[PDB]
């Protein structure tokens, strides 16, 4: 790997510089290099990894949606034929997106998840696994679409099971996991009622636990609870 000769601490330092410069591709390559040193990641380091790839794949997803919408309009009745270029370029962006997802899933499988024993790391990585299978599902149209969807579901479900057993209902990782799993139900699994039920139950159980928290933990938790409410407002 191209980062094999750089110190782990230097890679982390440069990931933070790249974040400040909004160079998220660089940030992701630095954090990939840090993961490949083989040591477990601290809480801060896990969040550098997720921030980096979330921004990279977020840009790809946005571009893919623009191109997919152009492609769908080109296949309506009355639209002039323009040749293969729209499909080709959508496929190019799609393949790059799938490559980023495969890279992240590869890091989780070799060997972040199998060494993660604490709930905060294990739930974080399983949420990530669910998320990046979800992004693969967003563009899947072939004979493996059902298996990709079930891979996302399975990862989210294991993360949910651990988070219910080991974390308080206000834990921001638990809350963000439930948020994203509810979106999986609504957008991927064609299960809007499950999406709404999960969002509502998650919000209500967090509300009842806010009294245990410091001011700063209260701020962290309520920020994600607001996203649950924002989704419920969109969906109901």
């Amino acid at each position: 790997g191209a980062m094999g000769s750089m110190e782990r601490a230097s890679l982390i330092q440069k990931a933070k510089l790249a974040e400040q410069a909004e160079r998220y591709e660089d940030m992701a390559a630095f954090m990939k290099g840090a993961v490949e040193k083989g040591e477990e990641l601290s809480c801060e380091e896990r969040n550098l990894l997720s921030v980096a790839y979330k921004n990279v794949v977020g840009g790809q997803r946005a571009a893919w949606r623009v191109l997919s919408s152009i492609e769908q309009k080109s296949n309506e009745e009355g639209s002039e034929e323009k040749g293969p270029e729209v499909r080709e370029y959508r496929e190019k962006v799609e393949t790059e997106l799938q490559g980023v997802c495969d890279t992240v899933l590869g890091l989780l499988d070799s060997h972040l998840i199998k060494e993660a024993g604490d709930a905060e790391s294990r739930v974080f990585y399983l949420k990530m696994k669910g998320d990046y299978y979800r992004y693969l599902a967003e563009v899947a149209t072939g004979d493996d679409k059902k298996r990709i969807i079930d891979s996302a579901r399975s990862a989210y479900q294991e993360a949910m099971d651990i988070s219910k057993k080991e974390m308080p209902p206000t834990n921001p990782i638990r809350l963000g996991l439930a948020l994203n799993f509810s979106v999986f139900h609504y957008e991927i699994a064609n299960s809007p009622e499950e999406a709404i039920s999960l969002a509502k139950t998650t919000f209500d159980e967090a509300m009842a636990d806010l009294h245990t928290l410091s001011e700063d933990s209260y701020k962290d938790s309520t920020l994600i609870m607001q996203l649950l409410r924002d989704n419920l407002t969109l969906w109901t």
């Binding site: 963000g176 994203n180 609504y186 957008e187 989704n231 969109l234």
Partner: peptide
């Protein structure tokens, strides 16, 4: 939808 909103995700984090």
């Amino acid at each position: 939808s909103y995700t984090v």
